[PDB]
Write a protein that binds this ligand. Structure first.
Ligand SMILES: O[C@]1(CNc2ncnc3[nH]ccc23)C[C@H]2CC[C@@H]1CC2
Length: 167
């Protein structure tokens, strides 16, 4: 039993809610919140911009030190950093950005990072400003993640389409 509330159960391990991931994180304070990161950990917009703003830019400061030490992530890769005031940990995961021409097959590799964590609050990878089809992202999530994932979908109109079209 966990403290996630109001989610629709899609499968054995995947749950979905129309919610602002920032507000969800502040309420639940989960062990792991997933960020929709880029390889440079430049949290300018989308989910990343919103999560970073909620940390008063502390996420960006930590991220800049991480990149200065380690260099960029791989598309499809991840790193674990602090969750600041939002969660114990933040799993920064880089899904392919279709608006940069990146290979959508890497979306499965991106979701595989979730399997290293028993429970996660997460957005749909590569959705929003990363330009992938969120219906496809949900399908890859369900077919790849085996740990317990609670998906927050900000857009209510999108949330309803994801549920009604879910196979
Ligand atoms: O890019 C996404 C993800 N963006 C977010 N998802 C959850 N909480 C959030 N808080 C701030 C931004 C944000 C994927 C779909 C739903 C919303 C947008 C556009 C389409």
């Amino acid at each position: 039993v966990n403290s996630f509330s109001g989610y629709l159960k899609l499968t054995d391990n995947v749950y979905i809610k129309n919610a602002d991931i920032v507000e969800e994180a502040k309420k639940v304070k989960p062990t792991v919140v997933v960020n929709a990161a880029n390889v440079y950990l430049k949290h300018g917009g989308g989910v990343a911009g919103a999560l970073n703003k909620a940390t008063n830019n502390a996420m960006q400061v930590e991220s800049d030190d991480y990149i200065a030490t380690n260099g960029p992530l791989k598309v499809g890769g991840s790193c674990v950093l602090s969750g600041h005031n939002l969660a114990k940990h933040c799993l920064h995961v880089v899904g392919p950005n279709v608006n940069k021409g990146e290979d959508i097959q890497l979306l499965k590799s991106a979701y595989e990072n979730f399997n290293q964590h028993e429970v996660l609050l997460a957005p749909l990878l590569s959705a929003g400003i990363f330009g992938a089809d969120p219906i496809h992202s949900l399908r890859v999530c369900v077919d790849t993640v085996r740990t317990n994932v609670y998906l927050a979908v900000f857009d209510k109109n999108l949330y309803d389409k994801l549920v009604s079209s879910f196979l």
